[PDB]
Amino acid sequence: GPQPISRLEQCGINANDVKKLEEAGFHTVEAVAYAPKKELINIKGISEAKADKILAEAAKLVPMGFTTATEFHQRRSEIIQITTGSKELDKLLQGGIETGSITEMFGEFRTGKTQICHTLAVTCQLPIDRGGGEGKAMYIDTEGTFRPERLLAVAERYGLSGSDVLDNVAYARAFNTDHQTQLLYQASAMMVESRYALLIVDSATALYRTDYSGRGELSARQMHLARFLRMLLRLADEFGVAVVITNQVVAQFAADPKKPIGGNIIAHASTTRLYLRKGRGETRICKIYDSPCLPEAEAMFAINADGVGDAKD
Amino acid sequence: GPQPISRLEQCGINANDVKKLEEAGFHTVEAVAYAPKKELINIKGISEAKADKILAEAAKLVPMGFTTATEFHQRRSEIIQITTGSKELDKLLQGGIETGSITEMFGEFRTGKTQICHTLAVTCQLPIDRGGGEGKAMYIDTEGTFRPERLLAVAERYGLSGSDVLDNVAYARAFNTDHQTQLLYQASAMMVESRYALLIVDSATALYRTDYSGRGELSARQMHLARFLRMLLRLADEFGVAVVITNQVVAQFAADPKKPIGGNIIAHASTTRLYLRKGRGETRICKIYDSPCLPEAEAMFAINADGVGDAKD
Amino acid sequence: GPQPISRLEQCGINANDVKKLEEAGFHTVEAVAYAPKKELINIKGISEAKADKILAEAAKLVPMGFTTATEFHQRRSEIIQITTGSKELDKLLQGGIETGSITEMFGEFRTGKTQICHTLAVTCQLPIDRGGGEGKAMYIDTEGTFRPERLLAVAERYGLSGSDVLDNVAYARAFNTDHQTQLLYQASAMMVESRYALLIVDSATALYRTDYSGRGELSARQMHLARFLRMLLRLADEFGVAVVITNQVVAQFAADPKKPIGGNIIAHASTTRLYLRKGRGETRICKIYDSPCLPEAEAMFAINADGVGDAKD
Ligand SMILES: Nc1ncnc2c1ncn2[C@@H]1O[C@H](COP(=O)(O)OP(=O)(O)O)[C@@H](O)[C@H]1O
Ligand SMILES: Nc1ncnc2c1ncn2[C@@H]1O[C@H](COP(=O)(O)OP(=O)(O)O)[C@@H](O)[C@H]1O
Ligand SMILES: Nc1ncnc2c1ncn2[C@@H]1O[C@H](COP(=O)(O)OP(=O)(O)O)[C@@H](O)[C@H]1O
Ligand SMILES: [Ca+2]
Numbered sequence: 001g002p003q004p005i006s007r008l009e010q011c012g013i014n015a016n017d018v019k020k021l022e023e024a025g026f027h028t029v030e031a032v033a034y035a036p037k038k039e040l041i042n043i044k045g046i047s048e049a050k051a052d053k054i055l056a057e058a059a060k061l062v063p064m065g066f067t068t069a070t071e072f073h074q075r076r077s078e079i080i081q082i083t084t085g086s087k088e089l090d091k092l093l094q095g096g097i098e099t100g101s102i103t104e105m106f107g108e109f110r111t112g113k114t115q116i117c118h119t120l121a122v123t124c125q126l127p128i129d130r131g132g133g134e135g136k137a138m139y140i141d142t143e144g145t146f147r148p149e150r151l152l153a154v155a156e157r158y159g160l161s162g163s164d165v166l167d168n169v170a171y172a173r174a175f176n177t178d179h180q181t182q183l184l185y186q187a188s189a190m191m192v193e194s195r196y197a198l199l200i201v202d203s204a205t206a207l208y209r210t211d212y213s214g215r216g217e218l219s220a221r222q223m224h225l226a227r228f229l230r231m232l233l234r235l236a237d238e239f240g241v242a243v244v245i246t247n248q249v250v251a252q253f254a255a256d257p258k259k260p261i262g263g264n265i266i267a268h269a270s271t272t273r274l275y276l277r278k279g280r281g282e283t284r285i286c287k288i289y290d291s292p293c294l295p296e297a298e299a300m301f302a303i304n305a306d307g308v309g310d311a312k313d
Numbered sequence: 314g315p316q317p318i319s320r321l322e323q324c325g326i327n328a329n330d331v332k333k334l335e336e337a338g339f340h341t342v343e344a345v346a347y348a349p350k351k352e353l354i355n356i357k358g359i360s361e362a363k364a365d366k367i368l369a370e371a372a373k374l375v376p377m378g379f380t381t382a383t384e385f386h387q388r389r390s391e392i393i394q395i396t397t398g399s400k401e402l403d404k405l406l407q408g409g410i411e412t413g414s415i416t417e418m419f420g421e422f423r424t425g426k427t428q429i430c431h432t433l434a435v436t437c438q439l440p441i442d443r444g445g446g447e448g449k450a451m452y453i454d455t456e457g458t459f460r461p462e463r464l465l466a467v468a469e470r471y472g473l474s475g476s477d478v479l480d481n482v483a484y485a486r487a488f489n490t491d492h493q494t495q496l497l498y499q500a501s502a503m504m505v506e507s508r509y510a511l512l513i514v515d516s517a518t519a520l521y522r523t524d525y526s527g528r529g530e531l532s533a534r535q536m537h538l539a540r541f542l543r544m545l546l547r548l549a550d551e552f553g554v555a556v557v558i559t560n561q562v563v564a565q566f567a568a569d570p571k572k573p574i575g576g577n578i579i580a581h582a583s584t585t586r587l588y589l590r591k592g593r594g595e596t597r598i599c600k601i602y603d604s605p606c607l608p609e610a611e612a613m614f615a616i617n618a619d620g621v622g623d624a625k626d
Numbered sequence: 627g628p629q630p631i632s633r634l635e636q637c638g639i640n641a642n643d644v645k646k647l648e649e650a651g652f653h654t655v656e657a658v659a660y661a662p663k664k665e666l667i668n669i670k671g672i673s674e675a676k677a678d679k680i681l682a683e684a685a686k687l688v689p690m691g692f693t694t695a696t697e698f699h700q701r702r703s704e705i706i707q708i709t710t711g712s713k714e715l716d717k718l719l720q721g722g723i724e725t726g727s728i729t730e731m732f733g734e735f736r737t738g739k740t741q742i743c744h745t746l747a748v749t750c751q752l753p754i755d756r757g758g759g760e761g762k763a764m765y766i767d768t769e770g771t772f773r774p775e776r777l778l779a780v781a782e783r784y785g786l787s788g789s790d791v792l793d794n795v796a797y798a799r800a801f802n803t804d805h806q807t808q809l810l811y812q813a814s815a816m817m818v819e820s821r822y823a824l825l826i827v828d829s830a831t832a833l834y835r836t837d838y839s840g841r842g843e844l845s846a847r848q849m850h851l852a853r854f855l856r857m858l859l860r861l862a863d864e865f866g867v868a869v870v871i872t873n874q875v876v877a878q879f880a881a882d883p884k885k886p887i888g889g890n891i892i893a894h895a896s897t898t899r900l901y902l903r904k905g906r907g908e909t910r911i912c913k914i915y916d917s918p919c920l921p922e923a924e925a926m927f928a929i930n931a932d933g934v935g936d937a938k939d
């Protein structure tokens with residue numbers, strides 16, 4: 001559980017300015033502790049006089065200094081690996097989708113990217129014993145291709161009350177690139193008033209191929225995309241929630257898998273890349289393209305009327 | 314072994330001001346001996362009255378005057394060349410990573426930069442007979458892509474106790490440019506209370522492409538980066554420890570290899586540049602871009618589940 | 627051979643004050659003869675009473691009055707032109723590096739500035755018949771990029787005993803601007819106890835871009851640099867030794883070649899400027915930017931494992 005921004009009020013910072021820290025999007029103390037000095041002066045009100053003082057006070061409330069690897073080992077061993085819904089993939093991922101980082105699944109059209117995200121939108125409220133996360137979910141949508149009709153079909157596969165499963169998940173369409181980033185600001189708000197566990201952006205680079213569809217602004221197409229993925233990694237180690245993004249890839253304009261999603265400036269954004277491919281048969285393959293800890297391996301899976309599942313045969 | 318700042322107390326300097334030398338970041342006597350007169354007056358407390366006196370006393374405790382090349386030859390022949398983990402590269406580097414200077418590996422995405430740094434994070438506590446350094450390690454991380462899961466895999470390749478290997482290494486994430494430089498201050502502290510041998514900044518220019526992502530502050534993007542690489546060369550001849558930084562390079566915003574890492578003001582920062590490139594096959598090549606002593610040569614290597622290794626065939 | 631300061635003791639000056647002339651840096655009689663009345667009163671001890679008397683006595687010991695051009699012609703024809711190591715450049719320079727003045731080579735990064743200085747650090751102890759100078763050498767270093775590994779490689783190219791070549795050269799790192807100027811004071815000392823022939827400052831303006839890296843002190847960045855180049859021209863006609871400085875230049879903060887090295891107050895410091903540039907091919911060009919006697923011309927050269935050499939083809 002993070003530390004809300006109200007705890008910083010009693011720490012030595014005024015009240016009229018803490019509300020100003022809020023309007024900038026910062027909702028907790030780690031959000032400012034993970035922020036540089038340059039970003040706080042950009043606020044129209046506050047200046048360098050307080051900015052030194054606030055960041056100094058925030059530093060003590062958030063562990064920021066060095067630490068051992070053993071202490072980081074037993075703390076990294078404790079992160080939740082969200083159940084993928086198919087036992088073959090859990091072994092490929094040594095648990096499943098790992099929270100606190102960016103998970104980027106990219107594959108050709110018709111590969112289950114939309115339904116994998118759907119199945120994950122319910123497997124996250126499963127109890128930890130069931131490999132879940134006991135946390136709320138969120139599914140910001142861009143293609144317009146999300147609908148509860150598939151969610152209750154997966155609740156019955158795992159024995160849940162779909163009446164409350166739809167309550168434990170939120171949703172909003174995205175029409176524009178500026179509305180995609182703006183929606184994260186709102187998203188960053190209600191993640192404080194609750195305990196979400198899985199944000200889903202499907203698809204991330206979808207809306208960037210339609211608005212920024214010119215040849216002169218290829219620079220701006222990535223500058224604006226970088227600012228988007230920045231706050232996404234932001235919200236990942238801020239609330240420690242899993243974030244899963246989606247991309248559509250061509251076989252032969254961030255579509256070439258030879259280049260990462262975060263263009264070149266933020267290319268270190270995605271920490272786990274899963275390439276989804278239809279095999280020679282009617283059976284799907286997930287390939288873990290890059291994840292320092294997990295091998296470059298493969299597994300097979302399939303999709304049923306009840307979500308992601310293991311291969312039939 | 315350096316000379317701690319406490320030895321300067323008994324040399325003729327007060328106690329309330331030696332604590333002030335500490336708060337400025339100076340932890341030993343060489344740290345002030347390698348400092349100019351301009352930098353000590355910038356302290357809010359002390360003035361030019363003592364600054365002449367302190368630097369005069371520090372001068373005698375640290376060999377500062379001229380010397381012969383023969384005396385520098387046999388003293389430079391004694392520096393440790395950290396074992397790279399692949400025998401082909403030791404010949405390319407005439408030993409491996411040379412301590413007391415800045416080592417900058419830069420290559421395209423997916424080139425082992427992250428895992429080479431990983432393998433070096435254990436090869437440094439090897440005994441000198443095993444080409445190691447018998448010194449602690451440090452891995453300040455920026456991409457978030459570091460994890461012990463690969464370290465114990467390399468300890469078994471060299472026969473070590475991974476339970477203590479993680480104890481002999483420290484680690485901390487970096488989120489902001491101002492937090493990158495601030496973390497060195499803390500780093501400069503616990504390097505006195507122990508004997509580190511290899512600092513690793515991976516990646517150095519990573520966080521400078523995300524915060525300073527505008528067009529007007531291209532000057533400030535390098536001014537702040539210079540102050541970072543300054544203290545890095547600082548800590549290199551201060552404790553005589555090896556410092557290895559990392560950079561991600563585009564094929565076709567310090568990403569063009571035609572320009573050095575330290576922009577233009579501190580461009581003399583990196584003393585050994587190694588360009589990492591995937592060949593026409595599935596085999597990697599390290600090329601020593603610039604190192605006055607080592608030829609502009611090439612070697613091949615590969616990465617396994619147990620760290621950097623020689624080519625399979 | 628200069629006249630040491632001890633000869634001034636028997637000339638009519640006391641002993642307790644001649645030691646005071648020493649502590650001020652003045653090691654011979656020309657050093658005070660080339661000094662103004664204003665500079666001697668700045669000493670805490672002596673006053674205008676002796677200052678008139680000392681400078682009057684020093685005047686007779688050092689030829690100071692007028693002279694003909696013929697007498698200056700045959701005396702200027704006798705100055706040594708240090709062999710550059712590449713026959714093409716000797717013709718461009720009508721002999722090579724001319725002693726008794728300031729030689730400033732400036733070029734882009736990766737132009738041989740470091741290795742040209744290296745090759746000159748051995749060509750100076752060559753006998754005069756071999757175009758050398760039969761004098762000791764000195765290489766005060768700032769970038770940290772000097773090492774004997776290249777010196778013995780050039781001794782074998784000219785047939786020398788590298789065991790003694792390193793003895794005939796001295797060296798010291800420079801970390802700060804105040805340590806750069808302070809090192810000249812020591813340098814001015816042991817140049818009396820021996821016969822040096824080539825001082826090398828590589829690079830001169832390097833350390834002035836790191837300490838004086840602010841916007842308010844652009845005045846002080848040159849004031850302090852002027853005091854440095856002052857004593858450098860000082861030591862040039864004092865011991866008549868060659869002094870070669872180095873500068874790193876940007877293509878598009880004394881980096882613009884449109885402005886000289888000595889900023890504006892001492893801009894007459896450098897007497898020969900050589901611009902080093904990588905041509906359209908892998909071959910280097912030296913261009914003599916300014917030298918009243920030598921034409922504005924060009925030549926080509928190259929660098930091998932054995933120092934500066936003529937073009938291969
Ligand atoms: N309700 C469903 N029940 C079963 N299979 C489905 C269902 N909807 C889609 N599929 C199958 O899953 C794939 C499409 O899933 P989807 O996640 O929408 O993929 P993508 O977004 O890549 O087009 C196709 O192979 C399709 O036959
Ligand atoms: N655990 C591992 N075991 C074996 N090979 C790995 C492992 N992790 C990554 N690799 C391989 O090494 C490269 C990635 O290494 P990494 O140091 O993370 O590179 P970079 O940071 O340049 O992306 C890829 O070729 C990948 O296949
Ligand atoms: N030991 C060496 N043997 C041969 N060529 C070298 C050697 N070291 C450097 N070079 C070459 O000389 C140039 C670098 O020389 P250097 O004097 O260090 O230049 P700069 O200081 O301008 O970077 C490059 O073209 C490099 O390929
Ligand atoms: Ca879809």
Ligand SMILES: [Ca+2]
Nearest residue numbers: 426427456458
């Ligand atoms: Ca990396």
Ligand SMILES: [Ca+2]
Nearest residue numbers: 739740769771
């Ligand atoms: Ca150089």
